[PDB]
Design a protein around this ligand. Structure first.
Ligand SMILES: COC[C@@H]1[C@H](c2ccc(C#Cc3ccccc3)cc2)[C@@H]2CN(C(=O)Nc3ccc(OC4CC4)cc3)C[C@@H](O)[C@@H](O)CN12
Ligand SMILES: COC[C@@H]1[C@H](c2ccc(C#Cc3ccccc3)cc2)[C@@H]2CN(C(=O)Nc3ccc(OC4CC4)cc3)C[C@@H](O)[C@@H](O)CN12
Ligand SMILES: [Mg+2]
Ligand SMILES: [Mg+2]
Lengths: 299, 606, 299, 606
């Protein structure tokens, strides 16, 4: 059947039954990084490879100032409505005198009466709404925090140092319980800050990024984002399967967003974002979302 | 995201000019920013989606001319804001701040139809739902002009004085039975109870006392919209003055073209009472904003490379913008009231980019750093074995001919052997031999990993059992006339198991299966088994276990692992022979797997 | 003692003996990446982070042309002597017409009678010795292969594209069996190729590299290498311990090496190298080499 | 690597000029390229090491003036190559190609000493050993001038005609007993049998038939080197003409300074016979090569930034080079025959860099991208758990107050609680509460991972046991007046074990120990145990297991994990209470570990 501690110098006089190798062996138990975390690593590898620095996104609660108002999204936008957003109840409002009053002033000014060459939005901005805590709808929020801190530090330093930032983290949407979409999901964001950038640079780093995951051909559709003009939906051709897919969204951040921060018109930021879940369930051929993540996600 | 327009398919008109069909309409919308969502009959309606911010694309008419200009012609549109004396409206102290503003408009001498009538109400619902955000910020009402005795006013009146015959009914409805009356209207219960729960109710009413409308969609039945309505009066009541402005400008703008003195709407004035504001407003406004850009910004942002202002004037025309040149280093655009979405020079740049075609901006071409794949593959192998609690080992690349052959009870292949395939696993290939080792035991470069871990196992047989090691590294052998040095390296992985009571012919087998399964390469047995359970396994390539004998392995217990359909031997697995356990001073049974991870690499999935 | 499948609704009527938590638990068995491979990963992470591309080093046999003669090391140098080098016996010589005869010609010319502004070595070069296979003494060899291929391709293309390369791989020395040093060990090499480089750039990327492993202060000693003029021994200050250490070697490759390849004097290459073993046994406080690697290397 | 010079310590002379002592000599050598290897008496010899390629630094005299110039003075050296008529040497048809060349030199009127004599022979051995590569390419011989009747010759003579009294003996030695005679000389057996095994033996011999030397170190005893040797003749016989040239130039160069007409050696001519070559050579050669550099190369290569040729002339002087300016964009250096190591403009650049000081080139300052540490730490935790065969899990961040508290048999802390420490593990901290979940079960953000994996275990209790999961992710809770949002996130890790017959109070404990051990953070029990075995464990910080009770854990079987000396609770571990296994529908025993990996992060070692 099988050798033993005793059967050396005495194994010759016995029967070695056939072993049916047309079979499987003993089942082995082994540990597993979650599929979603493997996807997250691969993306993070791509990002560190292109020289990018991870941003801090260690938070789920966000004030609407960072999530909406500092991105130059108006307060009467469907993204700021209860139906589509988890608003926070008990820690309902953030601290007064969050960030800097000068920045808050710039944001109110541009939102209401225009500034920086922009016409504005021609409503009257309310500080009261800006302080309502939500579960962040995107990590674009933390990117805006980071953009503001590097504005505030380069105003003191006087120097505009080019930089590259990425984040991968969970965000929340008040979708239904009938699995139309997901209540939670992870978002991948990257951006670059320097002097005089534009869609040529976006398409460069975009095709870089995306070939790095096996999509050599890209196409670009104009679409709308309130924080990014111009903006383009990104499609890419999946080699191993038949068709083109929607793989990302991106654009150039608006002047009202950045210049409110302190940046001069020289400075521009290019940014893009995409899901983690969709790559995952495509690569591993996962049918529906609830077989990956959540309490009923075995194997 | 985005609002789905339901337009027709008989839809395609002259307006289109070509009646170009689906396939080039598709690259036209892609190049423009629209996705053609669906087509579905009731025959063959086209439901499309448009930017949420270009409210001048929420009706078929606003699309028609936009997409028309996108290629066809600018067709510099004509307006005519006549008139203030015969047709006005006033806003009462009553009006307050729950719903402050009204904007009115008079489209005189209007063409009438019954599916142009469908057109109108589709437009009204669309602006109600998105811009107006389900009527929460503005409500629009369409009244036949002629049935409303001017002037008119907008007040918050005591509900007991409100009585009118809504569009629904033939029977009057008092204010104080109003909500209760529509409380269960499927289409309207929504709006009703929330929007309005004031002490007084908001009404727009003519000088004849005739209630004409309210926040809740009901309006008087008397000013109905029906064909043979010679001309129209529109009111829009709202909490935001500006968005109501934009609302009515869109409405009268977009059906001016289909009233017989085409592209002409008559105008109204709204004078608030002393207490509220106190001011007044002459609708329609219709101002152009005429921002002027600088020539460096537009190409640095748009990444348009080399092009100048003589190339710009045609580009905006396709987006329905009017354009003229000031200077090599200056522009002069006027925003159409159309484009409420333009707040900055960058919105013009966006439109110029779209007119240019997002497929025609030349890329930065950012040079990336490719990554060696062999390293990649072996690191995945490392991880998948560490996760089964196997410990990695690293041995000497040099040994003695005595260790590799004699103690292993075997002899190496000939240096003139021409059956040797460089893609296969070649443990007894002819070795690389050293001239001057200054250390006697260093005669050759290893050609198999198994010997060194046999040494290792002997080293640690005292330790705690079972022993579960693996090594993964380079082997070398002689290849005359096939490499530039006449030698080659290969990358092997060996997995050794040892225990007092068993050679794991079951656990080594399972380990090989598990390791290869990680890369979606399966046994043929596995593929048969799971397809009898009617499951689709990766079948196009696989591996099999071929029983053979080997001087160094206990008989009937060693196997060649063979890649199919290539038919290439890429590993061995079995029990180690007791004699060579003696030779290597090993007093416990031992099982082994060795594979040449370079054979299977290109079929592995990672 | 411990709960069971049966003791839910019936656990209340029993004795729960004390558990001595002042103890260790069940010993767990777990798998291990080799310490040396962990060190190798960390270095490789540092390298991919600075944008570097791994070179091919898939070989242990090297012709003396690539190992010695193409690096502009003379044939009568102590590195090419039996005492310090494993020369190959059976695959003793490589193929005639290895690489290109023009390159071989350039190397003989510079070695013997000088060229490219160099005086040369004023001996007579022998093609016979250049073809003797060895076990490679360094991976500088494969770097020289790679430098030659990018020369050969940029001559055709006409364009000098800046690039960065690293390798980590085993090399061999004919040291003794009395553990003076090691017979085998792994070497880490990096280099950069571009126009008009020099020691300023070397010290830049060097302090980059080395802070990335926790050595913020560097010092530099002139020393000698036959392939690198100028060249500097690199010392770095180890924070967590008392003293400065020798941590690397580096310099700028000689003109005789590169220009023989095809490069113009515009082109220069900066390079550095270091051990894998020494970091490993410092980080993990390994006493002597034979407790890490080799047949007697448990734990 | 490198050759170790053994110089004295009384050594320090005037030559030095300052007699500066060890500490600044050290930064001088570091700045120069020398490492001071050791000092050891016989009193206090200084053994140093010098570049292998600057053969003009292999004797004390060559160092002295080099390091002297390095700071002190250039001291532009003087030569004087007199003379060809009275003192020559000829090379025979015999000489062949086994050892072809000889180079001779005559240092006339020389100072003599007995430790200058030590100096000489130390120099001779050094050049023999490294440049000459243990005499295999050149052999040097030092003969008193006067005892050699000129002219002299170098031949391959029949061994039966070779007879002379070597330095060793007083008794003659024939050629055909030569090897056998020295075959067991400790110092020389090496050289002998290998170098020379020709039919004839190579001798240098004067016109009086007197054998003076051979390849094997023995020379005639008659021309010994001993004090009161007025002046010296040197021969160097070698297979490479050039390296012999460089050899003797070094020798007579470096002791010219200590013959009384200082810095002057007399010269010789060597005329090969018709058959061999046929040519001749006038030693010493002593040519300067005078390469001239261009000003862009030197700063682009040396990275010297801004500096011009007026700054260059002083810099080379410190290296003992002579320097003059041609032009703002041109140089004029002459190589001293000294510097045999200079083949290219870059060797001058190297020396200019050294003269500049490697500590004074301003760095590129290449801006690197820092990396988040929390990600780093959690990925290490992931790997160390995967390697024990635990499977990673990812749950919902939102749940119900009913799941977190009631089913867990507990209530959360107060919103006015001021004992709450943000660095600790705070499972019942006051939660973050949602206003409008559109899904009833989404009342709060989770504050502990344990509940969701209790749900998970319930989900998979049908699956194969044991279940070994872990999750590692963010928790949130309310922190009024302590963050800018009044909420905070923490990063927790929870490890759940479940099995039919046991709650693993032993395996969870071992898992915690193993996981923390990976980061060299130990139990206090561990530290006691392994220090009783007299082992040094990381002791400066550690953790302990504090028994407590918990509503949700079976009594006497749950523990706080506490970081010391900080005294901060950072996890919990124990058996789950049967009642809450009922509440969560779990019919098998379950054990748990949860820790806040942000408390321990700064003491973890990675
Ligand atoms: C609201 O839901 C949006 C979600 C999610 C998404 C979309 C956009 C962003 C963004 C952004 C952004 C834009 C500008 C600046 C900053 C951030 C983030 C997430 C995915 C984004 N999408 C998405 O990930 N799809 C995708 C992405 C990559 C990919 O790789 C190839 C397989 C190898 C494959 C698929 C696109 C679609 O899946 C889309 O259906 C759904 N999108
Ligand atoms: C022949 O043996 C050389 C070996 C090995 C080494 C040295 C130089 C090179 C090189 C090179 C080179 C130079 C120029 C161009 C290309 C390659 C390669 C290996 C280590 C090189 N050395 C070495 O690794 N030491 C070292 C390096 C890094 C380090 O990191 C800090 C702990 C965190 C710590 C120690 C230096 C010394 O250890 C030295 O004693 C031994 N050197
Ligand atoms: Mg736009
Ligand atoms: Mg030098």
């Amino acid at each position: 059947l099988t050798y033993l501690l005793i059967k050396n110098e005495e194994y010759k006089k016995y029967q070695v039954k056939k072993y049916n190798f047309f079979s499987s062996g003993k089942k082995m138990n082994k540990g597993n990084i979650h599929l979603l975390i493997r996807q997250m690593r691969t993306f993070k590898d791509v990002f560190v490879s292109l020289g990018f620095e991870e941003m801090n996104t260690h938070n789920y609660v966000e004030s609407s100032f960072w999530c909406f108002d500092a991105l130059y999204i108006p307060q009467q936008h469907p993204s700021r409505d209860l139906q589509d957003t988890f608003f926070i109840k008990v820690p309902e409002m953030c601290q007064e005198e969050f960030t800097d009053q000068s920045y808050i002033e710039n944001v109110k000014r541009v939102h209401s009466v225009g500034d920086y060459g922009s016409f504005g939005w021609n409503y009257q901005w309310e500080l009261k709404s800006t302080k309502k805590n939500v579960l962040r709808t995107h990590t674009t929020a933390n990117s805006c925090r980071a953009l503001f801190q590097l504005a505030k530090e380069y105003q003191k330093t006087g120097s505009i140092i080019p930089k590259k930032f990425f984040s991968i983290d969970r965000v929340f949407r008040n979708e239904n319980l009938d699995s139309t979409h997901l209540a939670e999901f992870h978002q991948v964001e990257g951006l670059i800050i320097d002097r005089n950038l534009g869609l040529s640079h976006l398409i460069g780093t975009l095709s870089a990024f995306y070939k790095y995951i096996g999509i050599s051909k890209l196409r670009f559709k104009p679409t709308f984002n309130p924080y990014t003009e111009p903006s383009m939906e990104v499609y890419g051709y999946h080699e191993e399967n038949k068709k083109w897919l929607e793989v990302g969204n991106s654009g150039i951040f608006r002047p009202e967003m950045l210049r409110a921060m302190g940046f001069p018109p020289e400075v521009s930021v290019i940014a893009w974002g995409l899901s983690l879940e969709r790559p995952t369930m495509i690569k591993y051929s996962i049918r529906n979302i609830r077989d990956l993540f959540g309490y009923r996600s075995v194997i | 995201m985005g609002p789905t327009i339901s337009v027709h398919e008989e839809d395609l008109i002259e307006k289109l000019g070509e009646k170009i069909e689906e396939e080039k309409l598709n690259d036209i919308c892609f190049e423009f920013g629209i996705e053609i969502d669906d087509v579905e009959y009731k025959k063959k309606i086209y439901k499309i989606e448009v930017p949420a911010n270009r409210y001048d694309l929420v009706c078929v008419e606003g699309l028609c001319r936009a997409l028309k200009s996108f290629i066809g012609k600018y067709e510099n549109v004509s307006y005519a804001l006549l008139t203030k004396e015969k047709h006005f409206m006033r806003v009462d102290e009553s009006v307050d701040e729950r719903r402050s503003y009204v904007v009115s408009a008079v489209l005189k001498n209007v063409k009438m139809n019954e599916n142009v009538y469908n057109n109108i109400i589709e437009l009204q619902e669309k602006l109600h739902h998105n811009l107006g955000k389900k009527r929460i910020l503005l409500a629009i009402g369409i009244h036949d002009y002629d049935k409303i005795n001017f002037p008119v006013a907008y007040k918050f009146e005591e509900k007991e004085k409100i009585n009118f015959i809504p569009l629904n009914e033939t029977q009057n409805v008092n204010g104080n039975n109003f909500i209760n009356f529509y409380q269960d209207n499927i289409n309207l219960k929504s709006y009703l109870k929330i929007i309005s729960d004031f002490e007084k109710f908001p009404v727009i009413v003519d000088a004849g006392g005739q209630i004409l409308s309210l926040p809740p969609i009901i309006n008087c039945d008397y000013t109905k919209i029906t064909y043979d309505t010679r001309n129209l009066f529109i009111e829009c009541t709202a909490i935001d003055r500006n968005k109501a402005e934009i609302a009515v400008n869109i409405i009268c703008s977009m059906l001016s073209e289909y009233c017989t003195p085409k592209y002409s709407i008559h105008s109204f004035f709204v004078q608030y009472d002393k207490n509220h504001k106190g001011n007044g407003y002459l609708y329609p406004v219709f101002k152009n904003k005429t921002l002027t850009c600088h020539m460096d910004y537009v190409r640095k942002l748009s990444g348009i490379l080399n092009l100048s202002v003589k190339d710009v004037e045609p580009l905006l025309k396709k987006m329905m913008i009017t354009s003229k040149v000031i200077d090599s280093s200056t522009f002069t655009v006027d925003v159409p009231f159309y484009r409420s979405d333009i707040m900055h020079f960058c919105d013009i740049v966006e439109d110029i980019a779209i007119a240019y075609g997002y497929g025609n901006i030349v890329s930065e071409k950012i040079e990336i750093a490719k990554k060696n794949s062999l390293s990649a593959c072996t690191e995945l192998f490392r991880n998948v074995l560490a996760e089964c609690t196997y410990t990695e080992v690293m041995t000497n690349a040099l040994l003695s001919k005595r260790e590799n052959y004699d103690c292993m009870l075997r002899k190496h292949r000939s240096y003139d052997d021409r059956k040797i395939n460089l893609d296969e696993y070649n443990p007894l290939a002819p070795p690389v031999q050293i001239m001057n080792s200054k250390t006697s035991e260093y005669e050759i470069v290893r050609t198999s990993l198994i010997v060194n871990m046999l040494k290792f196992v002997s080293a640690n047989k005292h330790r705690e059992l079972p022993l579960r090691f693996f090594e993964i590294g380079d082997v070398s052998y002689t290849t005359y006339d096939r490499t530039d040095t006449n030698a080659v390296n290969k990358r092997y992985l060996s997995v050794i198991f040892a225990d007092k009571f068993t050679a794991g012919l079951e656990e080594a087998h399972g380990m090989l299966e598990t390791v290869l399964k990680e890369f979606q390469l399966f046994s043929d047995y596995k593929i048969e088994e799971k397809s009898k359970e009617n499951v689709a396994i990766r079948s196009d390539v696989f591996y099999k276990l071929v029983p053979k004998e080997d001087p160094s392995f206990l008989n009937e217990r060693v196997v060649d692992i063979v890649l199919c359909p290539h038919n290439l031997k890429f590993g061995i697995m079995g029990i180690i022979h007791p004699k060579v356990l003696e030779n290597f001073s090993i007093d416990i049974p031992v099982s082994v797997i060795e594979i040449n991870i370079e054979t299977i690499m290109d079929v592995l999935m990672m």
